[PDB]
RNA sequence: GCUCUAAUUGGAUGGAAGCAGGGGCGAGAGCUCCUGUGGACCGAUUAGUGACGAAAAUCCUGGCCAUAGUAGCAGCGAUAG
């Protein structure tokens, strides 16, 4: 497909070839997942003194 | 059903949470409304998180009732007024 280039003022100018991975079928699962382990992550280690 | 995280999305000084009493739903775990009190915070859905649910362990700590206005405040070679 193609996609609609705009200027600062918000007025059309050109467009260009939308690229192939904006084709990508949409995984809600596959997102969900990445997202949960980029999530996990960055959590801290604890636990009470032992 | 409980905690806290995230996304999405709501409620509250025109009165949140909690608590007391009461009305409705669910087989039920439990949900929800009304009144009073309270006087500042509280949810829902989804995906997570876990120090997550008690009637019991001679269980732990604290508080409290009965026991009870009961035992003792006599006994001793110093009977003390
Ligand atoms: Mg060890
Ligand atoms: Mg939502
Ligand atoms: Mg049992
Ligand atoms: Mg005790
Ligand atoms: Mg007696
Ligand atoms: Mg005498």
Not at 2 to 29: C, H, K, W
Request: no cysteine; proline share 4%.
């Amino acid at each position: 497909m193609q996609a609609t280039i705009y200027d600062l003022d918000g007025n059309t100018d050109g467009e260009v070839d939308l690229p192939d991975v904006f084709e990508t079928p949409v995984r809600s699962d596959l997102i969900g997942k990445a997202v949960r382990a980029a999530q996990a992550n960055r959590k801290q280690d604890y636990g009470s003194d032992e």
